Amino acid sequence: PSPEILALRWKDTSAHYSPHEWVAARNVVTANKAALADYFYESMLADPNAAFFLSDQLVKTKLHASMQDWLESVYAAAPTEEYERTVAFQRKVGEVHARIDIPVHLVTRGASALIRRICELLDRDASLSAAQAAATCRYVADVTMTAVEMMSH
Amino acid sequence: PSPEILALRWKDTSAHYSPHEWVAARNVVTANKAALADYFYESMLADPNAAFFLSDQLVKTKLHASMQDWLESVYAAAPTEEYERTVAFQRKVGEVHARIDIPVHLVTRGASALIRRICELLDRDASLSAAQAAATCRYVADVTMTAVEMMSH
Ligand code: HEM
Numbered sequence: 001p002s003p004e005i006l007a008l009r010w011k012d013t014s015a016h017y018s019p020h021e022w023v024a025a026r027n028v029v030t031a032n033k034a035a036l037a038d039y040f041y042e043s044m045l046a047d048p049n050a051a052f053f054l055s056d057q058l059v060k061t062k063l064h065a066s067m068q069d070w071l072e073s074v075y076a077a078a079p080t081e082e083y084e085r086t087v088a089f090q091r092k093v094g095e096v097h098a099r100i101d102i103p104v105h106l107v108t109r110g111a112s113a114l115i116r117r118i119c120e121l122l123d124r125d126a127s128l129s130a131a132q133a134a135a136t137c138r139y140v141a142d143v144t145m146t147a148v149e150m151m152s153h
Numbered sequence: 154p155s156p157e158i159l160a161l162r163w164k165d166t167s168a169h170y171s172p173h174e175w176v177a178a179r180n181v182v183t184a185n186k187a188a189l190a191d192y193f194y195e196s197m198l199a200d201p202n203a204a205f206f207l208s209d210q211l212v213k214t215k216l217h218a219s220m221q222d223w224l225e226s227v228y229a230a231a232p233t234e235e236y237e238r239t240v241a242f243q244r245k246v247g248e249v250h251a252r253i254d255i256p257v258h259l260v261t262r263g264a265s266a267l268i269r270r271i272c273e274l275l276d277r278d279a280s281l282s283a284a285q286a287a288a289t290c291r292y293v294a295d296v297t298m299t300a301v302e303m304m305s306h
């Protein structure tokens with residue numbers, strides 16, 4: 001659909017959470033982006049269906065950088081009101097994955113592992129209350145699922 | 154698509170987790186299904202966009218029962234190999250929601266709140282290790298997102 005419609009989708013999803021959630025998620029994710037990208041790659045390697053698309057160290061470096069780029073894209077949208085930019089990024093990742101035939105089940109597998117790991121970081125962050133950790137975790141799951149939907153189209 | 158293709162999708166997603174995850178999720182969810190359904194309804198009521206589709210106590214009772222039914226459907230599939238039955242249930246819920254124009258963003262909002270709440274129950278369950286809690290939480294997110302996708306089609 002139109003950028004406008006997709007941007008409105010991200011905005012509607014984000015609007016259910018407060019700017020404190022948007023910022024707490026952006027802070028924790030961006031502070032741990034390399035570790036998150038490292039964990040994602042190890043998750044892929046440990047799964048034969050995903051490892052089927054992996055090869056050498058050069059591709060490992062590219063995957064790590066692109067994951068860091070995606071984490072920045074996803075978490076920047078709501079607090080910067082750059083909905084249209086994030087939405088185009090998701091459609092581009094989807095087009096790149098589809099052209100190489102990455103099955104959606106592996107994308108959702110990776111997204112599930114990211115949701116849990118980000119949520120663990122939030123529960124460990126001393127500066128967040130348990131209320132804040134849970135609300136930000138809900139936001140994380142919601143934008144992650146929303147991104148997966150956009151990629152899949 | 155065909156039941157066969159959708160059933161294979163659920164099977165492929167579920168196959169990434171061990172039967173211990175499938176059973177731990179089913180046990181905790183089914184033991185807390187009414188509380189989960191109660192929490193879901195309170196989540197809807199507290200959100201003006203969702204409350205827009207709520208009315209009286211009679212509908213509250215129907216929503217509570219259907220949520221309990223969905224939780225049983227989702228968590229039964231993998232451990233009983235009843236992929237086709239769960240997959241038909243998701244398409245039916247999708248058809249029911251679409252006919253009444255429930256926006257997808259509110260479905261994903263609810264799914265995010267379910268993922269967090271189920272994951273909290275798993276982290277609190279004394280009989281699960283932290284390793285098991287995290288793996289079962291990943292499974293919960295993965296089948297939840299998978300179900301939302303099927304509903305949305
Ligand atoms: C949450 C899940 C995922 C996210 C957010 C993600 C994100 C990305 C991004 C941002 C790119 C770069 C796109 C571009 O060039 O503009 C990319 C490319 C790619 N992704 Fe993913 N991806 C995910 C899942 C996966 C999975 C499960 C696999 C493999 C099983 C995979 C393998 C690849 C590969 C092979 C490329 C191309 C790498 C290259 O340039 O050689 N991705 N992905």
Ligand code: HEM
Pocket residue numbers: 009104144145146147148149152153257258261298301302305306
């Ligand atoms: C590989 C194929 C597809 C995948 C994996 C896919 C996936 C998804 C997912 C994951 C969601 C919502 C879940 C979430 O928000 O996390 C969704 C919603 C939706 N899907 Fe698809 N889809 C596919 C193909 C299609 C096609 C071909 C159509 C229509 C021609 C379609 C129409 C829709 C519509 C209309 C919605 C709800 C509208 C919205 O919220 O943007 N999908 N899809």
Ligand code: HEM
Pocket residue numbers: 197202203204206212215216219220222223245246249250253255259260261263264267
């Ligand atoms: C994870 C999210 C959701 C799940 C799993 C879910 C599940 C279900 C199920 C199982 C049914 C019964 C379908 C049937 O008759 O066979 C249903 C119907 C319905 N759902 Fe949902 N739903 C979700 C989100 C929502 C949301 C966000 C709303 C409102 C904003 C909503 C409002 C309704 C309504 C009004 C009905 C029809 C109730 C009636 O019979 O009068 N649902 N849903």
